[PDB]
């Protein structure tokens, strides 16, 4: 709901990338800065936010340009999308989209619209930013 942050160390996005960290996300959709999640993983094996049991390599980096978020396809901003009741989504390739556009992008091809990596219905999950 605004510019992205990592709820553990509480840095903004700029600030996160500035110092050579990643932004990443669980399979449960919760976002963090890669250090913090690695350190958390050091002590347990559950999502800091919802307690989902991840047990490693059930997370990956994601890529977003501004810090604020917007689906490149429809060109909507966060508020707009949500208020419509759509979901924010990322591919496993780390590339982010509104649920709707992507759903439809798959109906024609089975490749990511930013990079091209093969995908299907399974390979994308919501994120909660």
């Amino acid at each position: 709901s605004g510019t992205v942050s990592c709820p553990i160390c509480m840095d903004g996005y700029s600030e996160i990338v500035q110092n050579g960290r990643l932004i990443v996300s669980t399979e449960c959709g919760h976002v963090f800065c890669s250090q913090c999640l690695r350190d958390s993983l050091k002590n347990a094996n559950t999502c800091p936010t919802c307690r989902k049991k991840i047990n490693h390599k059930r997370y990956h980096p994601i890529y977003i340009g501004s810090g604020t978020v917007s689906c490149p396809i429809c060109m909507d901003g966060y508020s707009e999308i949500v208020q419509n009741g759509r979901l924010i989504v990322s591919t496993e390739c780390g590339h982010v989209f509104c649920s709707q556009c992507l759903r439809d992008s798959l109906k024609n091809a089975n490749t990511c619209p930013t990079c091209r990596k093969k995908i299907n219905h399974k390979r994308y999950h919501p994120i909660y930013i």
């Binding site: 553990i8 160390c9 509480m10 350190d39 559950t46 936010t49």
Partner: protein, 147 residues
Amino acid sequence: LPRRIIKETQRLLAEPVPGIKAEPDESNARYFHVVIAGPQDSPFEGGTFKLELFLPEEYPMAAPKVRFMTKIYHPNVDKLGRIKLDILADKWSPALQIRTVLLSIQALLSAPNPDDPLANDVAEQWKTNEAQAIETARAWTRLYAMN
């Protein structure tokens, strides 16, 4: 100080939660004197309870430490103010922030569990004679939490 700590401190200063009042100590930034208003239809209710919170360095990694400085009748809070809440020990998640914890403790007051309990004598009383216990709780509130 780690940024987060400041934000949290700063954020607490910026926007007060209701019935929960939290002022950091002058000598130590990581140390806090805290006041919790008793939740509604508790025996404590319309009560005021002092707590003190400190955070170890490892925090967020290590959970904060909280204790009651006001004597209170409750199964989870022992005679020395030590709180037995799970999110302070096992279930600690770095994502939880001070403000959350605080509310969690407030909440705890509403819903005591003697099912397993720290302050065993009380617990026994609460399961056996809830009505009484509740009354005693109100008593103690009067005695200790009205000033």
